[PDB]
Amino acid sequence: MCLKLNLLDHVFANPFMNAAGVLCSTEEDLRCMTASSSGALVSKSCTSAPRDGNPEPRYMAFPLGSINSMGLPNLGFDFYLKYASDLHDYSKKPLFLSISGLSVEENVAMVRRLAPVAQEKGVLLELNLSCPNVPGKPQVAYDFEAMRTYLQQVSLAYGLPFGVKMPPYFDIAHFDTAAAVLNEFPLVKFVTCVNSVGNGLVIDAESESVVIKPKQGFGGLGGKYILPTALANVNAFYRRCPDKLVFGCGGVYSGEDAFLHILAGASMVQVGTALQEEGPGIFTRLEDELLEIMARKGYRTLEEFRGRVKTIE
Amino acid sequence: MCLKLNLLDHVFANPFMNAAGVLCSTEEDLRCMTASSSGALVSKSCTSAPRDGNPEPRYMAFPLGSINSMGLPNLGFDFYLKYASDLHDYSKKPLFLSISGLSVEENVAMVRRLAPVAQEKGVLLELNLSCPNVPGKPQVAYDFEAMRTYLQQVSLAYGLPFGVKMPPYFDIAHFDTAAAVLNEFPLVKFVTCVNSVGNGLVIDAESESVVIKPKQGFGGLGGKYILPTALANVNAFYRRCPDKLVFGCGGVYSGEDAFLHILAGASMVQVGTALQEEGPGIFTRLEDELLEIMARKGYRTLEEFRGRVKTIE
Ligand SMILES: Cc1cc2nc3c(=O)[nH]c(=O)nc-3n(C[C@H](O)[C@H](O)[C@H](O)COP(=O)(O)O)c2cc1C
Ligand SMILES: Cc1cc2nc3c(=O)[nH]c(=O)nc-3n(C[C@H](O)[C@H](O)[C@H](O)COP(=O)(O)O)c2cc1C
Ligand SMILES: O=C(O)c1[nH]c(=O)[nH]c(=O)c1CCc1cc2ccccc2c2ccccc12
Ligand SMILES: O=C(O)c1[nH]c(=O)[nH]c(=O)c1CCc1cc2ccccc2c2ccccc12
């Protein structure tokens, strides 16, 4: 019985990794994720320049999940590129580097410089599309013309396999259109579904107040709120992108949640809110829990059930 | 202390009602809602002709909420019109009638016939904009040009105050666009936020199967999963539509949840999943619980706190 995966020319001890943004901002964070039982790690989505992010409180968690409007606080691309090129121990596990430029040109400038490091050290790029465009326009992955532009220019500038982090969609016509856009790009080898469910609002009944300060309390939702949304997105893209991998993200707190992701089509399984709340010891628990489900069902490897969710009649 | 209120030229005993589609399809259901302690009731969204809906199982509930792909089973407009015209006891509470025609012409046809019954009896129209659209296109409320057409045509055809049932949005630019469309229509006097969160996917780990039959297991989510999404949509429209009322729907299981809807801006509070699960006795529990929170806080009226959610700094 084993959780090993071999994909994108790397080997992974198990499918678990952090979700971008959680336990991955500082060198300390990245060393901690490297020391953990996770099968891989992803660095915080970065911009060319360092960012302080939004005012606090900007993240809160609760029994059913979390809300955040962090505002992309990060140490800047030069720091993450240095961690990839000089500090990360690739004998421990593979590294993904996520970027989230504020314009197409900013993303192009970073992927041009990542390319040689990607080729020589094997760091893998995750482009965050679930992210700001021009203010007053929807985030980039909700604007399919901007998404196509971004992917064309990054493909040309990078020239190497990469993947994309996608927001959730809610309408079949959107699943169809988004998968079609992605399928125009052969260098997009994985698709991570999903980023946070956007612009939720948590209100505290005692204080009669929202719980985060930015954006009048509005922010992205993660955790138990979003598992069925996450599963739908994973499966929708799994069915529509037969030449790409899908990584699952959203609502994983247990090996059974990871099992459902994998049944939906997930290759790698990322952990955001639950990891923020529990800490990196979650990875040993998730592994043990998933292996237990596999033993009860007689499954020896992940491929025996990945994408094999049954439908009715 | 009572929770009585006046809206849209009608008096309501309390702000609670069923959500369209729950306990309101048959004459029996409508009589049971009328006999309940709810403040109002809404009939099942209807088409011109009766529909059997999708194959079963088509609804499933779980501790965190529900998933459905009912396929609009309903008795047909003629039946709900007859109920509004001849069978509903208006001395007991107000009645809303929900229409969900498959095209703009179908909706125009039903509203021209509804108009004289609305004038004579005071039945209120709720137009469901989660209805079907043209080839390769999203639901109507996710196509702002189709939305504007629908609202232009219904407004012209009906000529009386009405409301609209909206799907959730997840992007601030979308809140801005959708609110601006609605604000073009002075006859749109209430906006109900929100319909189910579209195209989620629930998977049972034991059976490795989806739990509903239609659409490969994909369906709309309600209940606890959707509360912060519903609060966000309520508050976004409350802020952007100052000359309309907002009706809140999504994730109400308790008087505390209702309190949060009202703080966000809700005038009426609709109950879907929790009503399907608990039955019409829920309405006395909700009233008691809301009155108890008001008493502890020192609030004597709903107006004292409606829309008064506090932001940080
Ligand atoms: C505090 C916080 C920061 C985040 N920052 C990023 C980010 O920088 N880049 C990104 O792709 N996703 C970011 N996310 C989204 C997560 O990667 C993930 O998609 C989301 O939280 C859903 O997974 P979960 O339900 O396990 O939380 C962030 C989430 C949280 C909670
Ligand atoms: C079984 C079922 C049938 C529904 N049918 C309709 C409908 O006919 N029209 C409509 O506007 N919304 C309909 N809905 C959506 C609800 O009115 C409501 O917007 C949604 O369930 C979210 O509220 P909740 O969290 O209380 O369930 C239906 C929901 C369920 C669960
Ligand atoms: O940093 C975040 O807020 C964030 N949180 C998530 O849940 N997922 C994400 O992908 C991100 C980053 C995307 C992003 C999200 C933002 C949300 C609210 C306000 C600002 C931003 C922002 C600003 C600059 C660059 C990126 C962002
Ligand atoms: O009847 C529903 O499935 C339904 N469920 C909800 O959660 N909200 C709704 O608004 C509806 C009705 C909207 C709707 C929803 C549908 C979902 C799957 C397949 C068909 C329909 C459909 C067909 C004709 C007219 C309306 C529909």
PDB file of C-alpha atoms in Angstrom, chain B residues 14 16 22 59 93 122 165 202 239:
ATOM      1  CA  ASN B  14     -42.867  38.414  11.413  1.00  0.00           C
ATOM      2  CA  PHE B  16     -39.951  34.732   8.175  1.00  0.00           C
ATOM      3  CA  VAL B  22     -39.381  24.278  -0.329  1.00  0.00           C
ATOM      4  CA  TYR B  59     -32.275  16.301  -3.374  1.00  0.00           C
ATOM      5  CA  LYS B  93     -50.602  36.188   5.642  1.00  0.00           C
ATOM      6  CA  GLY B 122     -52.419  41.722  -3.616  1.00  0.00           C
ATOM      7  CA  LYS B 165     -34.544  36.144  -6.863  1.00  0.00           C
ATOM      8  CA  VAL B 202     -21.200  15.927  -2.961  1.00  0.00           C
ATOM      9  CA  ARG B 239     -25.536  48.922   0.221  1.00  0.00           C
TER      10      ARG B 239
END
